[PDB]
Amino acid sequence: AYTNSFTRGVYYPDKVFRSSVLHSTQDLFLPFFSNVTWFHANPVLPFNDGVYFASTEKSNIIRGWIFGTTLDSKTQSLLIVNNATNVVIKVCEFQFCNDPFVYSSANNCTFEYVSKNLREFVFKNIDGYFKIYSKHTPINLVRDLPQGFSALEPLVDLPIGINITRFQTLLAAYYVGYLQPRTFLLKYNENGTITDAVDCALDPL
Amino acid sequence: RFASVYAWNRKRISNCVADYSVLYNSASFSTFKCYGVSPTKLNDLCFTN
Amino acid sequence: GKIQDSLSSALGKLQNVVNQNAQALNTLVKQLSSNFGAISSVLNDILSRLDPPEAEVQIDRLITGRLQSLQTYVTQQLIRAAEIRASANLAATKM
Amino acid sequence: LSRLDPPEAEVQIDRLITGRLQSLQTYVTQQLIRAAEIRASANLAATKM
Amino acid sequence: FNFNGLTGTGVLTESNKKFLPFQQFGRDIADTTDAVRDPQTLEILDITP
Ligand SMILES: *[C@@H]1O[C@H](CO)[C@@H](O[C@@H]2O[C@H](CO)[C@@H](O)[C@H](O)[C@H]2NC(C)=O)[C@H](O)[C@H]1NC(C)=O
Ligand SMILES: *[C@@H]1O[C@H](CO)[C@@H](O)[C@H](O)[C@H]1NC(C)=O
Ligand SMILES: *[C@@H]1O[C@H](CO)[C@@H](O)[C@H](O)[C@H]1NC(C)=O
Ligand SMILES: *[C@@H]1O[C@H](CO)[C@@H](O)[C@H](O)[C@H]1NC(C)=O
Ligand SMILES: *[C@@H]1O[C@H](CO)[C@@H](O)[C@H](O)[C@H]1NC(C)=O
Ligand SMILES: *[C@@H]1O[C@H](CO)[C@@H](O)[C@H](O)[C@H]1NC(C)=O
């Protein structure tokens, strides 16, 4: 299946506070009214330039992603997991099950870390930095993509250096958009939050 | 063990406190040439990356 | 009684002269963040990663640009004031 | 551009840019001064009509 | 003043602008720094000129 985003996948381009100021930016965004894949419950996808990723449930079936170029040994990859305990970021050379849902190798680790609902994420990878924005909104549905505006706040920053060309998902309904270089007009509140936006390449208006 | 020149290494520095005056006056380096900045003003700048 | 309704419910000629002046003053400040062909837009960045013989050449590129922009601002104000002057001269004759 | 390499050509292209931008500013400033003279004439015509 | 890289001059004053937990500093239109966050105590301060 395929579905239509309406106004989704807006993130704060960076720090620096700000108030009522229709500020104009050029960056990698998810264009308005886009063609987002639909998945039910999964396969190896591409990355190619960032990723939007929403998901819906009350239980927790979506238990992180896995990234990289080959998703195996002979080259390095990232692994982001969450058991019923808490998040586990990790960067080794792995041996991944072709249908993984545990691994089979954890060699040469170069980075470790340990510790209904709508959960959006924006993943991007620039200059050896793997940035992750996120937002958790409560739906009043169970598992369908709603409509509305909600800007995504930066979460993490990892100075890895890793190359990425592919990614997957991990399970115990989700969508995948892609990001392109667009120009947007963001409306800032007086507290400094983005309340509305304009995609400046959707038509003459 | 350093890496070869055709596939060179690239280490990225993170949040730290760097002291370049102990590098500029080590008297063991055969060549210390800075290009985008004078060397004596190295200790006072905050390089984003 | 109808003037009062039609206004209470038209002053575009007064709004336009306010808008033009603000649009010019904003363009003047927004030019303080262009390089004009230099390494940055900040003098505390050319005076921190360049020795004095090399920072002169980069400071002059900023000086030339900023002088150009200030003088453009001052010419367009003379031309806009000569037009406000004729309007006020007509208002004085109508009074 | 096809007889020099970038570092060398950017220097000449900036001189060309500076001259060509000065010419356009001269043109626009004189059109502004010449249009205010045409407006004072059309205002006299409206009063005569 | 110098706030971990931000070099400037002015009067510093206690703020009341809720810098979202992730905003390093403020910024007014026409792009001039007008608020900062103190790294040690993490409070927002306006920078009047
Ligand atoms: C940076 O260190 C200072 C102390 O060196 C921290 O100041 C403490 O702040 C707490 C408030 O939660 C006070 O209860 C302590 O008494 C303070 N300590 C001192 C010695 O004054 C400061 O909080 C640290 N920065 C951050 C961001 O936590
Ligand atoms: C998305 O693209 C596919 C490609 O064939 C197309 O079949 C589908 O109709 C498109 N969806 C929308 C909503 O345009
Ligand atoms: C959760 O998974 C991580 C992955 O290595 C593991 O370290 C941790 O021990 C797990 N939680 C528990 C309670 O074992
Ligand atoms: C990575 O692991 C392989 C196999 O364990 C090993 O041969 C290689 O030396 C490791 N990489 C480094 C940099 O040591
Ligand atoms: C990523 O892959 C490309 C393949 O074109 C390679 O040239 C590049 O060096 C790789 N990245 C790094 C950091 O080595
Ligand atoms: C946030 O914004 C709302 C409406 O814009 C305002 O009423 C409130 O005072 C602001 N600050 C808060 C909630 O701390």
Swiss-Prot record, chain B:
- What effect on the protein does mutating residue 23 to I have, as reported in its record? In strain: Omicron/XBB.1.5, Omicron/EG.5.1
The organism's superkingdom is given as Viruses
Effect of substituting residue 26 to F: In strain: Omicron/BA.2, Omicron/BA.2.12.1, Omicron/BA.2.75, Omicron/BA.4, Omicron/BA.5, Omicron/BQ.1.1, Omicron/XBB.1.5, Omicron/EG.5.1
Which effect does the record note for changing residue 28 to P? In strain: Omicron/BA.1, Omicron/BA.2, Omicron/BA.2.12.1, Omicron/BA.2.75, Omicron/BA.4, Omicron/BA.5, Omicron/BQ.1.1, Omicron/XBB.1.5, Omicron/EG.5.1
Role played: Attaches the virion to the cell membrane by interacting with host receptor, initiating the infection. The major receptor is host ACE2. When S2/S2' has been cleaved, binding to the receptor triggers direct fusion at the cell membrane. When S2/S2' has not been cleaved, binding to the receptor results in internalization of the virus by endocytosis using host TFRC and GRM2 and leading to fusion of the virion membrane with the host endosomal membrane. Alternatively, may use NRP1/NRP2 and integrin as entry receptors.
How does the annotation summarize its subunit structure?
Binds to host ACE2. RBD also interacts with the N-linked glycan on 'Asn-90' of ACE2. Cleavage of S generates a polybasic C-terminal sequence on S1 that binds to host Neuropilin-1 (NRP1) and Neuropilin-2 (NRP2) receptors. Interacts with host integrin alpha-5/beta-1 (ITGA5:ITGB1) and with ACE2 in complex with integrin alpha-5/beta-1 (ITGA5:ITGB1). May interact via cytoplasmic c-terminus with M protein. May interact (via N-terminus) with host bilirubin and biliverdin, thereby preventing antibody binding to the SARS-CoV-2 spike NTD via an allosteric mechanism.
The identity of this protein, by name, is Spike protein S1
The record lists the organism as Severe acute respiratory syndrome coronavirus 2
Q: Its encoding gene is what?
A: S
Q: Which residues of the full protein are shown?
A: 346 to 394 of 1273
